[PDB]
Design an enzyme around this catalytic site. Structure first.
Site, PDB file in Angstrom:
ATOM      1  N   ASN A  99       0.819  -1.205   0.000  1.00 17.35           N
ATOM      2  CA  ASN A  99       0.000   0.000   0.000  1.00 17.35           C
ATOM      3  C   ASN A  99       0.856   1.259   0.000  1.00 17.35           C
ATOM      4  OD1 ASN A  99      -2.472   1.734   0.775  1.00 17.35           O
ATOM      5  ND2 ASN A  99      -1.066   2.094   2.489  1.00 17.35           N
ATOM      6  N   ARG A 157      -8.232   5.508   1.816  1.00 17.39           N
ATOM      7  CA  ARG A 157      -7.572   4.853   0.687  1.00 17.39           C
ATOM      8  C   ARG A 157      -6.587   5.722  -0.086  1.00 17.39           C
ATOM      9  NH1 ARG A 157     -12.672   2.565   0.441  1.00 17.39           N
ATOM     10  NH2 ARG A 157     -12.585   0.356   1.050  1.00 17.39           N
ATOM     11  N   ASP A 166       1.877   6.972   0.210  1.00 16.15           N
ATOM     12  CA  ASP A 166       0.826   6.165  -0.384  1.00 16.15           C
ATOM     13  C   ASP A 166       0.937   5.940  -1.888  1.00 16.15           C
ATOM     14  OD1 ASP A 166      -1.515   4.924   0.896  1.00 16.15           O
ATOM     15  OD2 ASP A 166      -2.588   5.980  -0.726  1.00 16.15           O
ATOM     16  N   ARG A 194      -0.367 -12.236   2.947  1.00 11.30           N
ATOM     17  CA  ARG A 194      -1.151 -11.467   3.895  1.00 11.30           C
ATOM     18  C   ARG A 194      -1.024 -10.110   3.210  1.00 11.30           C
ATOM     19  NH1 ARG A 194       0.404  -7.160   7.646  1.00 11.30           N
ATOM     20  NH2 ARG A 194      -1.276  -6.917   9.191  1.00 11.30           N
ATOM     21  N   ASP A 196      -1.011  -6.571   3.661  1.00 12.73           N
ATOM     22  CA  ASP A 196      -0.933  -5.554   4.696  1.00 12.73           C
ATOM     23  C   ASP A 196      -1.726  -4.303   4.333  1.00 12.73           C
ATOM     24  OD1 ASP A 196       0.406  -4.284   7.130  1.00 12.73           O
ATOM     25  OD2 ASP A 196       1.093  -2.946   5.528  1.00 12.73           O
ATOM     26  N   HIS A 200      -6.662   0.182   3.402  1.00 11.81           N
ATOM     27  CA  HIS A 200      -6.136   1.386   2.780  1.00 11.81           C
ATOM     28  C   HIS A 200      -5.987   1.301   1.277  1.00 11.81           C
ATOM     29  CE1 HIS A 200      -5.711   2.960   6.751  1.00 11.81           C
ATOM     30  NE2 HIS A 200      -5.258   1.770   7.099  1.00 11.81           N
ATOM     31  N   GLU A 232      -5.623  -7.771   5.365  1.00 15.81           N
ATOM     32  CA  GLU A 232      -5.723  -7.190   6.698  1.00 15.81           C
ATOM     33  C   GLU A 232      -6.656  -5.995   6.650  1.00 15.81           C
ATOM     34  OE1 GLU A 232      -3.456  -4.171   8.007  1.00 15.81           O
ATOM     35  OE2 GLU A 232      -3.586  -4.579  10.156  1.00 15.81           O
ATOM     36  N   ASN A 297      -2.492 -10.695  17.201  1.00 15.36           N
ATOM     37  CA  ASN A 297      -1.600 -10.607  16.052  1.00 15.36           C
ATOM     38  C   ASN A 297      -0.418  -9.738  16.469  1.00 15.36           C
ATOM     39  OD1 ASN A 297      -2.466  -7.905  15.775  1.00 15.36           O
ATOM     40  ND2 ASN A 297      -2.632  -8.051  13.540  1.00 15.36           N
ATOM     41  N   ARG A 336      -4.860 -18.888  12.536  1.00 17.86           N
ATOM     42  CA  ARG A 336      -3.471 -18.460  12.529  1.00 17.86           C
ATOM     43  C   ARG A 336      -3.012 -18.382  13.981  1.00 17.86           C
ATOM     44  NH1 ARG A 336      -2.208 -12.665  10.259  1.00 17.86           N
ATOM     45  NH2 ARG A 336      -3.314 -12.114  12.194  1.00 17.86           N
TER      46      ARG A 336
HETATM   47 CA   LIG Z   1      -3.660   3.749  -0.045  1.00 13.66          CA
HETATM   48 CL   LIG Z   2      -3.012  -9.444  10.510  1.00 18.93          CL
END
Ligand SMILES: [Ca+2]
Ligand SMILES: [Cl-]
Ligand SMILES: OC[C@H]1O[C@H](O[C@H]2[C@H](O)[C@@H](O)[C@@H](O[C@H]3[C@H](O)[C@@H](O)[C@@H](O)O[C@@H]3CO)O[C@@H]2CO)[C@H](O)[C@@H](O)[C@@H]1O
Ligand SMILES: OC[C@H]1O[C@H](O[C@H]2[C@H](O)[C@@H](O)[C@@H](O[C@H]3[C@H](O)[C@@H](O)[C@H](O)O[C@@H]3CO)O[C@@H]2CO)[C@H](O)[C@@H](O)[C@@H]1O
Ligand SMILES: *[C@@H]1O[C@H](CO)[C@@H](O)[C@H](O)[C@H]1NC(C)=O
Ligand SMILES: *C(=O)[C@@H]1CCC(=O)N1
EC number: 3.2.1.1
Length: 495
Positions: A99, A157, A166, A194, A196, A200, A232, A297, A336
């Protein structure tokens, strides 16, 4: 949506901040024989080397390039790990930080894990390469340029998550560089990712990137195998963005899971285990087939992200084992297991000032994971996945895979029990008095080893033994003073 683990292996373990060579060894000496499905590894791409504070764990969430060169090891060591783990049937899942790049205020230079040059101020990351027009500076509409209000789905976002530059994920060039990185990993042998900070990223941009990904390496996986994707997304309600918006891309982390399980086990706000009878969607959770569940986590075990003060961790060992046990026994979601390192936690006015401390190290070099004769770990690695109570519940989940949730019992307080078809049965006592009762187990008659207090070794039980009669009933006795206030038995712990 499928983990791509071997048939019968139902969990993945997060070997947080572990070095590649240690994970490779762990796959061969432990994860394989103990039935673990796979390992979530820390970001394998080059990140910013942060010295103030000293090498915090979170520096790995500030990418500098996509070179597989970190404190965990170099590319050759990464490949060696993936190859060795796949060769023993244990998968590797990569924490993909796609991201953003580094914090926008980090000083320009070569303070990176592979020495690559980067200039946050000028939006220059030549090692990728990315430049100014590859970021969302012009797209973001907040006055600070950072995310300021989660009630505005657009800025969440298009703006910077705590200052992290970003990426302009709508651009084919950016999507292609990310895909180049992920495909390098897939061709190396990784089984999934995963994603991340998925909240976003626009669901559609994630989809566009996933559409560029290869099928898994055909030397280890069946033709047409798609990489496992778990995004996530922290959705605890109260915000416009919902986890369901991401179902078309893959699974999603269900943060409501550990949050509520923690409040229930801690008996906060009048909650109690008897309420867990309808655990799952009945508690407002997402569909089981889209959930990636966990008790804690790497973020919330140290107060980062979300989940709250209710989150149970290895610091709360006794209650933690019970929470993990309940999770591993219950059919909801794909599980997990967390594996952590110990740090000098220091609470000041209710908050841990050392929540930034990185993995065990000698002058910045991550310490190897040492294995003690009793199978526990040294060098401050907690290795929850090696705790008998957790390791045996990981096998419990494998043994009962596919079996229905049945034979539920509760005392209207905190003494509950339930079975998984005719393959397993588990009993919990979280009340402040003894749980002594005969319960219907749904299991075949015989003598079973409790896998929480012991193991089945050489035709005998090292701990508590449970006797199931011809009617499927067995007597259970768990004092509120028991080392571990829960008992679990299954088809493969039968004598
Ligand atoms: Ca973003
Ligand atoms: Cl996570
Ligand atoms: O050529 C010198 C130049 O190289 C590097 O520029 C790269 C850009 O940073 C990178 O964004 C990409 O540019 C593409 C655009 O993103 C895309 O929208 C479209 O316009 O095609 C462009 C070219 O492929 O690639 C270039 C070239 O690698 C480096 O970052 C610069 O600092 C340097 O001046
Ligand atoms: O298979 C190895 C051993 O696994 C188990 O040991 C665990 C404990 O169960 C776990 O609680 C933890 O010890 C903690 C202790 O019980 C807790 O009260 C305290 O707060 O923190 C402790 C950590 O120092 O970790 C060990 C493993 O290191 C199992 O109990 C044991 O018999 C097995 O030999
Ligand atoms: C089980 O334990 C008992 C008592 O130690 C012992 O006599 C017996 O031989 C053991 N059985 C096996 C299969 O080892
Ligand atoms: C599931 O995790 C993966 C990604 C979505 C799909 O079809 N397979």
């Amino acid at each position: 949506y499928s983990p791509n683990t071997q048939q019968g292996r139902t969990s993945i373990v997060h070997l947080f901040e572990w070095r590649w060579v240690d994970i490779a060894l762990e796959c061969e000496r432990y994860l394989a024989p103990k039935g673990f499905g796979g390992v979530q590894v820390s970001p394998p791409n080059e990140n910013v080397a942060i010295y103030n504070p000293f090498r915090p764990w979170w520096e790995r969430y500030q990418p500098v390039s996509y070179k597989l060169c970190t404190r965990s090891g170099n590319e050759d060591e990464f490949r060696n790990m993936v190859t060795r783990c796949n060769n023993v049937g244990v998968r590797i899942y990569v924490d993909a930080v796609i991201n953003h790049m580094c914090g926008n205020a980090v000083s320009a230079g070569t303070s990176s894990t592979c020495g690559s040059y980067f200039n946050p101020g000028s939006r220059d990351f030549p090692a990728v390469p990315y430049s100014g027009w590859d970021f969302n500076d012009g797209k973001c509409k907040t006055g600070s340029g950072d995310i300021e209000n989660y009630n505005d789905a657009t800025q969440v976002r298009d703006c910077r998550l705590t200052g992290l530059l970003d990426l302009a994920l709508e651009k084919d060039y950016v999507r292609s560089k990310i895909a180049e990185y992920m495909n390098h990993l897939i061709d190396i042998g990784v089984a999934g990712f995963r994603l991340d900070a998925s909240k976003h990223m626009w669901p559609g941009d994630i989809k566009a990137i996933l559409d560029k990904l290869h099928n898994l390496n055909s030397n280890w996986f069946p033709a047409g195998s798609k990489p496992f994707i778990y995004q996530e997304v922290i959705d605890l309600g109260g915000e416009p963005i919902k986890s369901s918006d991401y179902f078309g891309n893959g699974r999603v982390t269900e943060f409501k899971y550990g949050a509520k399980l923690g409040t229930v086990i801690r008996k906060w706000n009048g909650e109690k285990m008897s309420y867990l009878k309808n655990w799952g969607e009945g508690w407002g959770f997402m569909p089981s087939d889209r959930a990636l569940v966990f008790v804690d986590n790497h973020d919330n075990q140290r107060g980062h992200g979300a989940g709250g003060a209710s989150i149970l961790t290895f610091w709360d060992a006794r209650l933690y084992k019970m929470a993990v046990g309940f999770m591993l026994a219950h059919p909801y979601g794909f599980t997990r297991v967390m594996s952590s390192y110990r740090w000098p936690r220091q609470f000041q006015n209710g908050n841990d000032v050392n929540d930034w401390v990185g993995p065990p190290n000698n002058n910045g070099v991550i310490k190897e994971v040492t294995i003690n004769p009793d199978t526990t770990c040294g060098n401050d690695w907690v290795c929850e996945h090696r705790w008998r109570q957790i390791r045996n519940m990981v096998i419990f989940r494998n043994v009962v895979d596919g079996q229905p949730f049945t034979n539920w019992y509760d005392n209207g307080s905190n003494q509950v029990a339930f079975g998984r078809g005719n393959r397993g049965f588990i009993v919990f006592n979280n009340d402040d008095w003894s749980f002594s009762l005969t319960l219907q187990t749904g299991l075949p008659a015989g003598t079973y080893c409790d896998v929480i207090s012991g193991d089945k070794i050489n035709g005998n039980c090292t701990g508590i033994k449970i006797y199931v009669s011809d009617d499927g009933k067995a007597h259970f006795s768990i004092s509120n003073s028991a080392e571990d206030p829960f008992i679990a038995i299954h088809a493969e712990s039968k004598l």
